Automatic annotation (TrEMBL), chains A, B:
<dbReference type="InterPro" id="IPR029026">
    <property type="entry name" value="tRNA_m1G_MTases_N"/>
</dbReference>
<protein>
    <recommendedName>
        <fullName>tRNA (guanosine(18)-2'-O)-methyltransferase</fullName>
        <ecNumber>2.1.1.34</ecNumber>
    </recommendedName>
</protein>
<dbReference type="InterPro" id="IPR001537">
    <property type="entry name" value="SpoU_MeTrfase"/>
</dbReference>
<keyword id="KW-0820">tRNA-binding</keyword>
<dbReference type="Pfam" id="PF12105">
    <property type="entry name" value="SpoU_methylas_C"/>
</dbReference>
<comment type="function">
    <text>Catalyzes the 2'-O methylation of guanosine at position 18 in tRNA.</text>
</comment>
<dbReference type="InterPro" id="IPR022724">
    <property type="entry name" value="rRNA_MeTrfase_SpoU_C"/>
</dbReference>
<keyword id="KW-0949">S-adenosyl-L-methionine</keyword>
<dbReference type="GO" id="GO:0002938">
    <property type="term" value="P:tRNA guanine ribose methylation"/>
</dbReference>
<dbReference type="Pfam" id="PF00588">
    <property type="entry name" value="SpoU_methylase"/>
</dbReference>
<keyword id="KW-0489">Methyltransferase</keyword>
<feature type="binding site">
    <location>
        <position position="155"/>
    </location>
    <ligand>
        <name>S-adenosyl-L-methionine</name>
    </ligand>
</feature>
<feature type="binding site">
    <location>
        <position position="146"/>
    </location>
    <ligand>
        <name>S-adenosyl-L-methionine</name>
    </ligand>
</feature>
<keyword id="KW-0694">RNA-binding</keyword>
<comment type="similarity">
    <text>Belongs to the class IV-like SAM-binding methyltransferase superfamily. RNA methyltransferase TrmH family.</text>
</comment>
<feature type="domain" description="RNA methyltransferase SpoU/TrmH type C-terminal">
    <location>
        <begin position="170"/>
        <end position="225"/>
    </location>
</feature>
<keyword id="KW-0819">tRNA processing</keyword>
Amino acid sequence: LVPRGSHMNPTRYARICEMLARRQPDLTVCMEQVHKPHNVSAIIRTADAVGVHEVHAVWPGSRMRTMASAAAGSNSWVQVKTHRTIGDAVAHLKGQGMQILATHLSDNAVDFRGIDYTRPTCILMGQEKTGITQEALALADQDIIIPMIGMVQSLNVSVASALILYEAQRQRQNAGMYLRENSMLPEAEQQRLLFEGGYPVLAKVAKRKGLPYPHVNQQGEIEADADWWATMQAAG
Amino acid sequence: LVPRGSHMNPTRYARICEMLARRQPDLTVCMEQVHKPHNVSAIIRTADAVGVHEVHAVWPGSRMRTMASAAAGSNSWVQVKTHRTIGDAVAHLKGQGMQILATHLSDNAVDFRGIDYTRPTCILMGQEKTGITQEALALADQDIIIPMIGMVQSLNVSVASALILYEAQRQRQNAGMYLRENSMLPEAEQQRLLFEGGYPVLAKVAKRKGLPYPHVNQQGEIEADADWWATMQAAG
Ligand SMILES: C[S@@+](CC[C@H](N)C(=O)[O-])C[C@H]1O[C@@H](n2cnc3c(N)ncnc32)[C@H](O)[C@@H]1O
Ligand SMILES: C[S@@+](CC[C@H](N)C(=O)[O-])C[C@H]1O[C@@H](n2cnc3c(N)ncnc32)[C@H](O)[C@@H]1O
């Protein structure tokens, strides 16, 4: 039911299921070639902290994708969807009814707090030290800036990401959008995450053996057939 | 009047003087043994961005003070006041009529957005990975937390500093507190900063030669007596 050594219990189940109930699948960040592992990690961490289920990345090149890989996998509870180009990502995100906000200084750029983050929203962050591409700018609905009232006129991309995600968290919390009886996530995503998060080592074993993820009940116990248990316990 | 090569002109003067008019000397952050240069730098940068004139640090040990020194000097427009102990810093800041907010999880801790940042305020940030000291906690007026709605329950100290400083910037901007005809800074601080910021290389030369800083006029020109100019130009 609950394998020895594993942390799962009725309480950790509750904590996980409450965390999924708070998940905001219509809110995301998209990293346009943001590739330094410390930035990718810090951005994912804030994404989790404001209830983002999935973040997006444009890592065109193989070295960029590989350097970023461990950081991309640093959080069991945030998946990273990779796109070849900003055209593909924005198409995909517009496809999900999301407004596309480009973190970018221009004459048309608006204070990031003037935005309604309670609607489906993608926050677009650009690279060190070059900013979002002209192509991305052409696809975005609106430029947003974080006002800087001193002499410096640039922030690190992790700090800028955190500030915009937490303005979304503020407005969503003020609108009560983290208080939910059920997750906005489909039941299948919730079971995937309960297992892949709750039993991260067993989820890898299941994948390698090409087995389905089993059901997890409110005790946090694994419910599966003798055949699943036997295959999962076989070498290796 | 304006030495050759220097950036100062009537426009850079305006930008500097408008920046001093926006300065919020009753708002600060105090770093309790926050010593990693990347964190000290990133915290100072956000401090500048929300109008902080002076930040505070508790760096008890000589190696901590030295490792942090370049980061402490990374921004011409933010001074760092060092204190031997948290007792000395909090005494000094309570002395300036500031409420002391400890970034710290407890049963008594309040959402950081519930705070009135429009009043004199010190944000107290604690070290990696240990948090604010029990002694600091005993001196603080109130614990604040940044709510984290996912599984992770910790942010990097630079990201947490940025989020609380920008909640102060939000509330201060909403109250119009960055729109001022004159600086809240004394005239003497404004001239110090105009010269030390506007002419950072000459301010060091003035100090080494033990000369006073001269007057800077609205053209951004240096106004000083033949004697100052002669001493400043002498070897070396
Ligand atoms: C030029 S990169 C900074 C370098 C990078 N963080 C590093 O570690 O080297 C800054 C990016 O963060 C965001 N950003 C930075 N400063 C900003 C500001 N003042 N307003 C809005 N967005 C900002 C933008 O997406 C921009 O592309
Ligand atoms: C434990 S240190 C993190 C390690 C350090 N940033 C590093 O580079 O290794 C976290 C500090 O940031 C602040 N902080 C972090 N997470 C926070 C949260 N969820 N709520 C409030 N403050 C937080 C507190 O001052 C705390 O002492």
